[PDB]
Amino acid sequence: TFDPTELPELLKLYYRRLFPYSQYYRWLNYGGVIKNYFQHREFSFTLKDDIYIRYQSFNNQSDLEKEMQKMNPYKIDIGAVYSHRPNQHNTVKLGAFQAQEKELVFDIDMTDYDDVRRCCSSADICPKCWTLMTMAIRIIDRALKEDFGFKHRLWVYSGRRGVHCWVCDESVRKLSSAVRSGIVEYLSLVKGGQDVKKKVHLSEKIHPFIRKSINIIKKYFEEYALVNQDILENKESWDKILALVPETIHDELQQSFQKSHNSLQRWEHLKKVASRYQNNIKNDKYGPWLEWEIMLQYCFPRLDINVSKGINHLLKSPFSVHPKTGRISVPIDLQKVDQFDPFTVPTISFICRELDADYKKTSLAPYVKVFEHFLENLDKSR
Numbered sequence: 001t002f003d004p005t006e007l008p009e010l011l012k013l014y015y016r017r018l019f020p021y022s023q024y025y026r027w028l029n030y031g032g033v034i035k036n037y038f039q040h041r042e043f044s045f046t047l048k049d050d051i052y053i054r055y056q057s058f059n060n061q062s063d064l065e066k067e068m069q070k071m072n073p074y075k076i077d078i079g080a081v082y083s084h085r086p087n088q089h090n091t092v093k094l095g096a097f098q099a100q101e102k103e104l105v106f107d108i109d110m111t112d113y114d115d116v117r118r119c120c121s122s123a124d125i126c127p128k129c130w131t132l133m134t135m136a137i138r139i140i141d142r143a144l145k146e147d148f149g150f151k152h153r154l155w156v157y158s159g160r161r162g163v164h165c166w167v168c169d170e171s172v173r174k175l176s177s178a179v180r181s182g183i184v185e186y187l188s189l190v191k192g193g194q195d196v197k198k199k200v201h202l203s204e205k206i207h208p209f210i211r212k213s214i215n216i217i218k219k220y221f222e223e224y225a226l227v228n229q230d231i232l233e234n235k236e237s238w239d240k241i242l243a244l245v246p247e248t249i250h251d252e253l254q255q256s257f258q259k260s261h262n263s264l265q266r267w268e269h270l271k272k273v274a275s276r277y278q279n280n281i282k283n284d285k286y287g288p289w290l291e292w293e294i295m296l297q298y299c300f301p302r303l304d305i306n307v308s309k310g311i312n313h314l315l316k317s318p319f320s321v322h323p324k325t326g327r328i329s330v331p332i333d334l335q336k337v338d339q340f341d342p343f344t345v346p347t348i349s350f351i352c353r354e355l356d357a358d359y360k361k362t363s364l365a366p367y368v369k370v371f372e373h374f375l376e377n378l379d380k381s382r
């Protein structure tokens with residue numbers, strides 16, 4: 001949390017000497033190969049007192065610099081590319097102003113993991129629970145890269161409680177809401193709200209996406225689940241895991257749990273016991289489906305779904321400030337995803353302090369270098 005009276009004086013300087021305007025324009029101009037592509041983009045500025053304006057568009061980079069430095073917006077959201085100039089949508093015939101293109105986006109909030117987190121809750125995050133986002137980035141990014149063939153993926157720290165992903169392949173920017181829904185369904189395993197206890201069910205045959213995602217989780221599960229969260233510490237915690245396991249084997253576990261001493265041994269026990277449960281009496285097929293359902297329910301990414309369906313849904317811009325923490329929405333170095341510390345992310349107050357002691361003078365520089373690598377990969381593919 002932050003004290004929000006300093007923000008305006010900090011924002012003035014940030015938009016004057018620190019915001020990477022050139023790289024930003026390179027990005028949303030996309031080479032200038034399509035006409036009106038930057039000029040038909042919706043921007044949404046949030047000002048002081050949570051007053052926000054929509055359908056703000058601009059002619060060129062300089063126009064953007066000017067109006068941003070004139071409003072010093074608390075928060076900047078990117079929208080869709082529309083049929084006409086967003087800032088002229090009243091002069092257009094009703095029914096002819098329609099969203100046409102936007103990147104495929106993903107919003108991941110840690111709040112959706114409160115049911116499986118024990119250290120933090122609500123908007124809080126700590127190094128112990130942050131591994132979820134790491135695995136989230138690992139799982140989704142892999143599927144985005146290999147199962148769908150998307151080459152241009154930008155991962156961004158949302159500034160507080162999770163991360164964002166912008167997918168910018170030219171054909172992906174054209175996808176309708178229908179295809180985006182289908183993509184989210186392909187990527188989702190944790191179903192059900194607070195109403196249901198067991199939120200993951202696996203079919204008898206395993207789809208490669210599930211096997212590969214499980215294998216990703218099997219890299220982190222020891223460190224995250226059995227040590228940092230201690231999901232099997234005592235009865236208070238392990239009864240939450242038994243709630244999603246068949247009851248005919250509960251007794252044997254509770255016994256074997258009390259006689260055990262820590263979460264490692266209890267997990268090894270649960271594995272053996274689940275690999276001996278018979279789901280179907282016809283066949284003598286046994287497997288780790290319950291083990292896998294547990295690991296998925298506790299570690300698999302939960303996506304904010306309605307963020308990805310809408311073509312015209314707004315998402316916080318990269319390098320925009322989060323007005324409730326002061327943190328800058330910085331890109332995530334994928335080659336160092338495990339090393340990403342959300343607590344080393346520069347705040348606006350902090351880099352303005354660094355500057356007075358251009359953006360490459362500050363701790364924002366390596367993040368801009370990440371953004372430029374993403375942009376140069378966009379340039380090569382053209």
Ligand SMILES: Nc1ncnc2c1ncn2[C@@H]1O[C@H](COP(=O)(O)OP(=O)(O)OP(=O)(O)O)[C@@H](O)[C@H]1O
Binds near residue numbers: 159
């Ligand atoms: N009233 C609104 N109108 C339009 N878009 C909205 C509105 N409220 C939120 N959004 C969009 O929803 C997106 C994601 O919601 P969310 O609360 O998760 O924000 P965030 O930027 O991801 O920050 P956080 O790290 O807290 O998740 C935002 O980037 C914003 O663009």
Ligand SMILES: [Mn+2]
Binds near residue numbers: 107108109163
């Ligand atoms: Mn978010």
Ligand SMILES: [Mn+2]
Binds near residue numbers: 108307
């Ligand atoms: Mn959200």
Ligand SMILES: [Zn+2]
Binds near residue numbers: 117119120124
């Ligand atoms: Zn935590």
